[PDB]
Amino acid sequence: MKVEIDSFSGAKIYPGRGTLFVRGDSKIFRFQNSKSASLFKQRKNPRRIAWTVLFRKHHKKGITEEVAKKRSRKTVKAQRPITGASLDLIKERRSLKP
Amino acid sequence: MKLNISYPVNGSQKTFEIDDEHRIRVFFDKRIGQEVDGEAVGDEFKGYVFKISGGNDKQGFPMKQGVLLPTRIKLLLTKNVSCYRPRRDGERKRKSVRGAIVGPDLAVLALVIVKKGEQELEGLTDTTVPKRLGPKRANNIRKFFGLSKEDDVRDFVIRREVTKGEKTYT
Amino acid sequence: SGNGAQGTKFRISLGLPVGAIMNCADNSGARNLYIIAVKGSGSRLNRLPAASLGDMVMATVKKGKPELRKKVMPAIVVRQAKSWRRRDGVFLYFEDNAGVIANPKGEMKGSAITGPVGKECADLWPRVASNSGVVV
Amino acid sequence: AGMTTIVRDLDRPGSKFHKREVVEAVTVVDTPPVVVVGVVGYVETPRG
Amino acid sequence: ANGATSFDRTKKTITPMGGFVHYGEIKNDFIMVKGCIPGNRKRIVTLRKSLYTNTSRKALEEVSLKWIDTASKFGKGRFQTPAEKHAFMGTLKKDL
RNA sequence: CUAAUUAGUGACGCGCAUGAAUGGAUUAACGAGAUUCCCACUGUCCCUAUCUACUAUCUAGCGAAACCACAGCCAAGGGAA
RNA sequence: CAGUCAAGCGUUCAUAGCGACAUUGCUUUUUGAUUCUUCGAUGUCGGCUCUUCCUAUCAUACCGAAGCAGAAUUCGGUAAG
RNA sequence: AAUGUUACCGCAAUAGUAAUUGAACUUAGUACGAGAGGAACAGUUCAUUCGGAUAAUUGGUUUUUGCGGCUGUCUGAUCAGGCAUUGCCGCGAAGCUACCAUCCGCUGGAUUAUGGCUGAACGCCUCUAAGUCAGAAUCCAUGCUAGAACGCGGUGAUUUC
RNA sequence: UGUACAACGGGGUAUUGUAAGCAGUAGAGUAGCCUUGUUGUUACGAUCUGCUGAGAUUAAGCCUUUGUUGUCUGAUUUGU
RNA sequence: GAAACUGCGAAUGGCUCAUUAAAUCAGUUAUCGUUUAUUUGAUAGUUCCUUUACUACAUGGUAUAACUGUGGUAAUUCUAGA
C-alpha cells in the first residue's frame, strides 16, 4: 500500500481515493478529488492557487522550524596508517616533535 | 531489503538482510543524509545512529542525492556528477535515476555509522582495515606527522615491505 | 475478445458503443477505426454493443490508405476515455480512444504502437505487448 | 452505522490478482452485547 | 486501535473523522462485513448464521486487513487522524 | 456513396404511356417548398439520473358537467356463431 | 403440417437418411367460399411499450439412431424451465 | 368498524418464487486416425443475460442560492446590498442516483425420456406382466416475499368518583 | 424532574480560497506647493504584499457537548 | 611497465550526389570588415603595502582516478556506498 500525492494540490491520496489521468505523452497525473482535477483541466497554475502545496512552498508559508538548526554530527580520530607498511612501526614514528 | 553498512572509522564494511517490513519501515519517507536510530531496525543495533548514504533499487538504478521523490526519473547528466561517467569531452547523457527518498522498491539501502551503539557488530567494530596509501607530497607528510618544516621529510616517508622469493624488499 | 486471446479479462466499464470512432494507434496506414461490432458481446433489446479496453471489435477505416478502406477488419482497443476501475481500487482514464488493426488470431497488422497502452490489453494480447512502449 | 473502505492482500490461486492488494467496500454494524430475558419452547403439531 | 492493523499499527478506532455521518461514534463491539447490507443507517438489523456450509474457495479464504479507512465521510476526507492533519497542515490561527 | 442502401447521385434507353407557349431544354439569384449526403452540434439513442416553479395531494370557503334500462368478481357451456 | 403401402434413391443394401404411383389425416398467423352478428358507429396498416399464452423446439439439460473412427453433422425421445 | 380492552412475541393455510448462457487455463496436441486433423468429464479463473440491494469509493445532479468571481443598473462615496421569471461563470458538501459505481443470488428429494436388475407369461427368450436400480434446464420441498383484514398460539398489564 | 428534552453558545467535521480594517521602500504612472531637491514634500493610482490556509458557511435528514436560558398533567375513549 | 590521471588527436581521411537555377561553381577581386590550434621568428627587471618590529620563496592548499573493500540489476563501454 502506497499513499500517493496529487500532482496539482500536493494532497496525500489514500487507496481508492480520487482519480488517475494518463496524458497523451504518457505522463501520469493523479488528483485527490474532482476539485484539483477540474482546476487542472482549466490550465490553472498551482503556484497561483493559494491553498496548494506548490503555492505555499513558493510563497514560503509557515515552513518555520524546518529552516531552524538541527544537531547531526560525529567524531572519529583513529588510525590505521598504511597498508603493507607494517603499521606496528607507524604509531612509533607518529609521536612527532611538536 | 539488504542493508550495506560502513564504519568509516575502521574502514569496515559488512551487509545485512532485514525482512519483517516493520523493521525496514523506519527508513521509509526518509531522504539521504537523515540520521536513523538503530533500535527500531533491530536489537543488534541499539543506540547505533545510521546515516542514509544512498542505494540501488530493483533493476539496479542508483539513488541520487537531491532529487527528492520516492521514484525514478530520467535526467540529463553532465560531467562531475553522480551516476554518470562521460565517455567523451562535453558528452552529456540522459539516464534513468532513482530518487533520494527511501521506499520498498529498493534492493539495497547504503548506510554509514555515525555513533556506535551499546553492542559490537560482527564484522564492523571487531575488525579494522588499514589505509592503503600514505602521504606523498612533501607538506602532506609534514602534516600527517606534524613536522614543522625542519625535520627533513626524507626519513618520515612510509616504506612498504615486499618479498621476492627469498629476497625481502622495501 | 474471444479467439487468440491468452488469458481472461476482468470486467471494465464499457466506453465505446457501436458507431464510435477511435484513433488508429499503429503504423499500418490507417488514421482511424469505426466500430461496427464487439466480439463476445451479448444481447438485450435496444442495447448497443460497446467495447472496452482490451476487447476485439470489428471495424472499418474511415480515414487512411485506400487499400485499408471500404472493408471490415478486426481491431483491438488499446485506450479508453471513459473512466474505469481496477481491483487495486483506482479509477483511471486515457486522453483518447485508440485501437490497432489485427487479424482474428490477435496478431497485429502494423509494426509499432504509438502512445501508451493499457496493461489489461497488453496482458490479453501478446503481440500488442511486444510492439508497445509505455504501458499504463 | 455505515460503510468504509479496506485494503488487503488477496489469496486466490489462479487469479490475476493473487497475492496482489485489492481495495474493497465494507459495512459496519454496531453490536453491543445482547441481554437474555426469557425462553420459549415450541412443540411440533400437524398444524405446524 | 479498533481500526488499526498488524500493518497499520496507529492507535485509532473505526470511527471516521467527524464520526459516522447520520449515526454516531461506535463505542461498542461491531461486525465488519464485506460489501453492503440491506436496510439503512440507524436501522435495527439481524445477522444470522449461514443455512449451509460453503466450500466455494471464496468462502474459507482467511482474510487479513492491511488498512481500514478512517477518513471523514462528510466531505472528501484528506486525513486519517487529527494527528495526521496537524502533521500535514502545520499550525493554525487558533491552536496553541 | 456505405460494413451493409426498395434511399441519393452519374450513366444507359424499342420510353407500359417523354417531348416542344397542352410550351421543350437550359438557368445565376431567391424559398418557413419535396429529397440525399457531409462538418459542427447535441439526452434522439445506448440508459437513465437529478434540480426549480406551478399542479396534483390534505384543509376553509365556493362549487359545475358528461353520462345513467337495471347494474357491476370470474372459467367454461350454450346462445343473434 | 403429419401419416400408411413400399416401386425406387442411397457403390452393395427398400425403410441410416430419403421416397414415386396411390391413399388416410391434422391445422385455422394463407387465400378463398358464406353473409350469422354490428350501418341512431366495436376508430385503419406498421411501429414503439408491456404482459401472458401455444409448441409443429432455433439455443440451452439428459437421452436413443446413424452410411457415428476422431472432430463436425444428421434423425429421433423427455422437454416451453 | 366489529368478534372484552390494550401490548409484546410468534405459528403458517393459501398464494407468489429465479436465475441464465459463454469463454479461457488445465485435462491435451491426449483419446481416435495412414495422415490431415482432433474432443470430454473432475479442477481453476473470468464473462453474458436477468434479479435484489446498497452509496465506502468514482461519476452525474445544485435554491446549501455555501464560498469565490463577472456584466448592467440602483442605494452620494466606502462598507454592505437590491433588481435582471434562480442574471451569468468556477468550485461546491448533504441527499438522491449509475453495469457510469460496489456488494449478494441456497440444496435436499421425488420423477420423464432412456439405459438396466430379478423374472414369468411362452420348460427357451425377454427392462415388465408382479416386484425393482440408475436417471433431465422437469416436479415437490429447502430457501425467499406476503400473511387469511371472518385461520391460529404463547405472553404482559388490565381503569372505581 | 433525568447519560431528560429544547433554543442558543462551544469544540470537531466539511465547503470556499485568503474577510473587513490598517499598513507598506510593491505599482505602468499622475498631478499640486515651494525652500526647485544631492530618496524634496503633501497627497492620489488598476493592482500587489503583510497581519491571513484568512473570513464566511456548516444540519435544515453531519458529529459532539460538565456552558447559558427555558420546558415538563391539555383533550377523548375503552370491560370478559 | 598494466591500470588510471594529465596533454594532444578524433573538425583530417574515406563515401555519396539527395537538395541546390543568381545558389553553388569558374576566372577575377576586397578585408581601411574579421577570427585563426599549430609551425616558424620575435617579445616580459615593475605582481606585496600608509612602505621598521612583516607577507610561506629553501617553494603555500585539498580533492580525486587507478587501487582496496562492501554492493545493486535479466540485461550495455550502467554504476552506488565506504
Ligand SMILES: [Mg+2]
Ligand atoms: Mg462530485
Ligand SMILES: [Mg+2]
Ligand atoms: Mg463535476
Ligand SMILES: [Mg+2]
Ligand atoms: Mg429498437
Ligand SMILES: [Mg+2]
Ligand atoms: Mg516487433
Ligand SMILES: [Mg+2]
Ligand atoms: Mg455519509
Ligand SMILES: [Mg+2]
Ligand atoms: Mg460522504
Ligand SMILES: [Mg+2]
Ligand atoms: Mg439505389
Ligand SMILES: [Mg+2]
Ligand atoms: Mg440514409
Ligand SMILES: [Mg+2]
Ligand atoms: Mg438518375
Ligand SMILES: [Mg+2]
Ligand atoms: Mg424513359
Ligand SMILES: [Mg+2]
Ligand atoms: Mg412491358
Ligand SMILES: [Mg+2]
Ligand atoms: Mg408547336
Ligand SMILES: [Mg+2]
Ligand atoms: Mg404533356
Ligand SMILES: [Mg+2]
Ligand atoms: Mg440561361
Ligand SMILES: [Mg+2]
Ligand atoms: Mg429551400
Ligand SMILES: [Mg+2]
Ligand atoms: Mg387529480
